[PDB]
Nucleic acid binder design. Structure first.
Ligand SMILES: Nc1nc2c(ncn2[C@H]2C[C@H](O)[C@@H](COP(=O)(O)OP(=O)(O)OP(=O)(O)O)O2)c(=O)[nH]1
Ligand SMILES: [Ca+2]
Ligand SMILES: [Ca+2]
Ligand SMILES: [Ca+2]
Ligand SMILES: [Ca+2]
Ligand SMILES: [Ca+2]
Length: 903
DNA sequence: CATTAAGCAGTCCGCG
DNA sequence: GCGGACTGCTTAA
């Protein structure tokens, strides 16, 4: 088999590499790497090395990495460019693996762990690690085993061994309901003292040294806690055994009233699952407890226990250990669905970077581009310092706030990467400039043609048409991968709807789910079989289809993020290829493209409808247009349609067969105007929206820019079994909006769009009457808690103190003296509730850590003093007022002359 | 070591 | 009480 790295580190003049050899064995080696860098040399110098602008370079081979570093400094002092890869481990990986890396994940040791630490005096700080570690569960992906290290004797209590038999039993039978499918994979190890637990865990760690180290919050809690506890008990040399190279780095972060630390373990790639989730999931969650995320991802209930976690081990050691095990497994379950570890491995090996560098788009692209250029014997430019400079982005159209009955939307495929490729935007393809006219002159095709020789952007840049750019070349590779996965995702999505349609008529039989590949549209034969399947088999198939869709989503959306990240990176001062000429060439071209096609679509639709000067395009943002389709429907007449699906089909056909070709013609002209390298402006129909035929639904509304709701029947070729709400920007979409309020506002919207004003009025009345009965957590607002210290004046709010911070300070006063109350952590999220006048907390609101019940000693008073009137007004009524006034609709029946009568 | 556009909630302040 | 700067937060793209 081909060899591949596991980890790589630079320690002084040594490269330390863990790798898999040709026999598939894990190996380690220390290499005294001899790096090369480059200097510009005279033209008369015969060389095989050229910089990206074609200037000749001489290679300088150094005896060691320090020598190479010191030469860089001398060159800086001289005032001459020192070219080449300055991150030497990237050069090392490039030299060692001079081929496309084909890796085997089964040979990669992925470790998932978590620890338990009983603490009678508040949160057990990792930097101090003053309490015993009393449990570790460590799952190893090679053994496929949960290794459980259980402390039986502690200063905080002596306990009996955990029982696997009780653990497997249903909770309703007094058990812990440890999932049956892992019961046989648990290796249980009790310990009479912490020293032998820890010693044995370290020996175990040596035998089974993680390559990928993950788990929930491992980087901020488990890793630094274990490292520090071992340091305190055995000494720091022993703690360094957690590094296969015995080298660590301690990062102390000062928070005025916190002081925590992160530990770098050289030769291990830590990918904290919370960080992976935040980066790759494209959610913004109100809480990041494993409980909350597990419920969201897996629809599993919270791990329940009685009393505080500080007393769980002594009162219920059986449950304590089971919950430690289950928490480890839950992360594995989330990853089985989301596949972020797989994604990280794919991306890291593709780029030839340390796996943990997938968190950095700049590092990822630096390595991809370096590897591409190195292949052509080209030499990369030195990184330079640049002052931070704001620059212009996308165009957003101001919509007229209103209801919009029939809407069809269109948007550009992968816009910014497509612009890069169409225009040929790269550091080394710049051909010169032209004299800019105002943007609106390009939009309206009145400005002089920029160039008849080079490929142009309306920002004034010109690019070579007849040569490849590393940026277009490498962005295309990732785009093509992205396109493949999105195809799989969309096929699975359409397949899902086929199954959902079939679930309307399930067959009364005993059968099995069809063995199919959900990444491809079902054949006619498969569809015929599906129509004869039982509900049980259909529901199993639907789970499999959705799981396939999620996998495709992870794969496509994060590749989309990577390529959009390159367009953004051009505008980041730390990027080797930072260049506002290139960054603005993209954004400015995008603004022209949107407004050009707005014009073209208005012209086309007026023509085919036989009118003049009517505005069909009601809105647009960055690369999308929203077309009012009322006049299209009215042209044929609503009466002609048999049902909703009839007009949906009609608009679908209209968009594909009439509008899209016209759009294509419009963009091809634009391409010729800018004399671009390749026409890649592909604008396809996105949504078809409207009310159910014969209903009083309004179909859609806009309140303003980035704020709208649409009742969608077809999205990007997926014909829904049931209409789906597309809501963007409104409070239903925001993590700061109370959970029950998101739900109620969405139902208000559903009623508006699908049923009409009276239906809305009926729901509002009901919700207002029942609001006070909702659980306090379901009606609490949410906010991130940043710069808490800044506004803290003796426990009271300083000037300009934000509302949520005021709540935190109220909470801090209420819990002061009590050691057993949960502390608010700087930068994390809190629930927030307004408080009635004269409350015993002595302020207008309280805030506490999100995803938690508010501590028992103050929960009673919060409930009593909660301001329901303020909460309803602020979170529910005011946003609804926004929606309904925009839609020209009332949520409460207004007074009328009819009030004089008895109905 | 490492993208911009834009809406809304809230504080401070002016206001016989 | 409610608008106009200005901060903070969180979206859409
Ligand atoms: N830097 C950066 N730019 C973004 C991001 N999301 C969107 N944009 C910019 C670049 C996109 O090309 C453009 C249009 O956004 P879309 O959401 O329509 O995505 P895009 O067209 O890239 O892909 P698509 O094929 O429509 O899924 O807006 C992002 O997360 N980061
Ligand atoms: Ca725990
Ligand atoms: Ca798009
Ligand atoms: Ca059937
Ligand atoms: Ca879009
Ligand atoms: Ca599309």
């Amino acid at each position: 088999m081909k060899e591949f790295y596991l980890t790589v580190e630079q320690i002084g003049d040594s490269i330390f590499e863990r790798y898999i050899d040709s026999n598939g064995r894990e190996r380690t080696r220390e290499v005294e790497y001899k790096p090369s860098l480059f200097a510009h040399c005279p033209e008369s110098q015969a060389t095989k090395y050229f910089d990206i602008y074609g200037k000749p370079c001489t290679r300088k081979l150094f005896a060691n990495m320090r020598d190479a570093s010191q030469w860089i400094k001398r060159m800086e002092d001289i005032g001459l460019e020192a070219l080449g890869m300055d991150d030497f481990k990237l050069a090392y990986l490039s030299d060692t693996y001079n081929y496309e890396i084909k890796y085997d994940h089964t040979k990669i040791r992925v470790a998932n762990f978590d620890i338990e630490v009983t603490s009678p005096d508040g949160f057990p700080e990792p930097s101090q690690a003053k309490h015993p570690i009393d449990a570790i569960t460590h799952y190893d992906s090679i053994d496929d085993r949960f290794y459980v290290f259980d402390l039986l004797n502690s200063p905080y209590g002596n306990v009996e061994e955990w029982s696997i038999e009780i653990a497997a039993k249903l909770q309703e039978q007094g058990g812990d309901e440890v999932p049956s499918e892992i019961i046989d994979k648990i290796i249980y190890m009790p310990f009479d003292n912490e020293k032998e637990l820890l010693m044995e865990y370290l020996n175990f760690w040596q035998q089974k040294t993680p390559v990928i180290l993950t788990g929930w919050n491992v980087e901020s809690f488990a890793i630094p806690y274990v490292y520090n506890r071992i340091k305190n008990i055995f000494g720091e040399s022993t703690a360094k055994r957690l590094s296969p190279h015995r080298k660590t780095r301690v990062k102390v972060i000062e928070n005025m009233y916190g002081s925590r630390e992160i530990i770098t373990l050289f030769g291990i790639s830590v990918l904290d699952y919370i960080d992976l989730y935040k980066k790759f999931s494209f959610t913004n969650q109100p809480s990041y407890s494993l409980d909350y995320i597990s419920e969201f991802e897996l629809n599993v209930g919270k791990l329940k226990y009685d009393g505080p976690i500080s007393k769980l081990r002594e009162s219920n050691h059986q449950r304590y250990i089971s919950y430690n095990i289950i928490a480890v497994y839950r992360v594995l379950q989330i990853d089985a669905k989301r596949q972020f570890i797989n994604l990280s491995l794919d991306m890291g090996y593709y780029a030839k970077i340390q796996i943990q560098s997938v968190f950095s788009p700049i590092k990822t692209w630096d390595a991809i581009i370096f590897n591409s250029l190195k292949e052509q014997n080209k030499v990369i430019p030195q990184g330079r310092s640049h002052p931070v400079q704001p620059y212009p982005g996308a165009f957003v159209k101001e919509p007229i706030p209103n209801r919009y009955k029939y809407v069809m939307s269109f948007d550009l495929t992968s816009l910014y990467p497509s612009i890069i490729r169409q225009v040929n935007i790269s550091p080394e393809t710049i051909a010169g400039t032209f004299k800019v006219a105002p943007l609106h002159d390009y939009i309206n095709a009145v400005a002089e043609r920029p160039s008849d020789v080079y490929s142009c952007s309306p920002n004034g840049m010109m690019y070579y048409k007849d040569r490849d750019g590393v940026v277009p070349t490498e962005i295309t590779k990732v785009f093509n991968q992205r396109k493949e996965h999105k195809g799989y995702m969309l096929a699975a999505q359409r397949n899902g709807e086929i199954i959902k349609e079939a679930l309307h008529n399930p067959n009364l039989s005993v059968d099995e789910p069809l063995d199919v590949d959900y990444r491809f549209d079902f054949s006619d034969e498969i569809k015929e079989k599906i129509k004869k399947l039982s509900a049980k088999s259909l529901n199993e198939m639907l789970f499999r289809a959705q799981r396939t869709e999620v996998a495709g989503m992870t794969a496509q959306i994060n590749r989309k993020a990577l390529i959009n990240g390159l367009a953004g990176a051009l505008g980041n001062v730390w990027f080797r290829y930072y260049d506002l000429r290139n960054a603005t060439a993209i954004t400015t071209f995008g603004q022209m493209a949107l407004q050009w096609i707005e014009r073209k679509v208005n012209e086309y639709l007026n023509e085919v409808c036989g009118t003049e000067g009517e505005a069909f395009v009601l809105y647009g943002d960055t690369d999308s247009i929203y077309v009012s389709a009322d006049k299209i429907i009215d042209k044929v007449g609503e009466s002609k349609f048999r049902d909703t699906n009839h007009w949906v089909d009609f608009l679908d056909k209209f968009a594909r067969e009439r509008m899209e070709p016209a759009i294509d013609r419009g963009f091809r002209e634009m391409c010729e105007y800018m004399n671009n390298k390749q026409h890649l402006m592909f604008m396809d129909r996105e949504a078809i929206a409207g009310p159910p035929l014969g209903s009083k639904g309004i179909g859609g509304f806009w309140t303003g820019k980035k704020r709208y709701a649409l009742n969608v029947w077809d999205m990007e070729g997926t014909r829904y079994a049931e209409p789906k709400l597309k809501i963007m920007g409104l409070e239903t979409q925001k993590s700061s909006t109370p959970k029950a309020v998101q739900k109620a506002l969405k139902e208000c919207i559903r009623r508006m769009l699908q049923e009409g004003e009276e239906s809305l009025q009926e729901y509002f009345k009901e919700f207002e009457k029942e609001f006070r009965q909702l659980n306090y957590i379901s009606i609490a607002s949410v906010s991130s808690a940043n710069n808490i210290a800044k506004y803290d004046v003796g426990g009271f709010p300083g000037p300009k103190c934000p509302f949520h911070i005021r709540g935190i300070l109220t909470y801090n006063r209420a819990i002061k003296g009590n050691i057993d109350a949960p502390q608010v952590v700087e930068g994390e999220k809190v629930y927030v509730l307004p408080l009635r006048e004269g409350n015993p907390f002595g302020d207008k609101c309280i805030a506490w850590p999100s995803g938690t019940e508010i501590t028992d000693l103050i929960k009673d008073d919060v409930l009593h003093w909660m301001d329901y009137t303020v909460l309803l007004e602020k979170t529910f009524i005011k946003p609804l007022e926004g929606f309904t006034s925009a839609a020209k609709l009332d949520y409460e029946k207004k007074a009328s002359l009819f009030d004089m009568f008895d109905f």
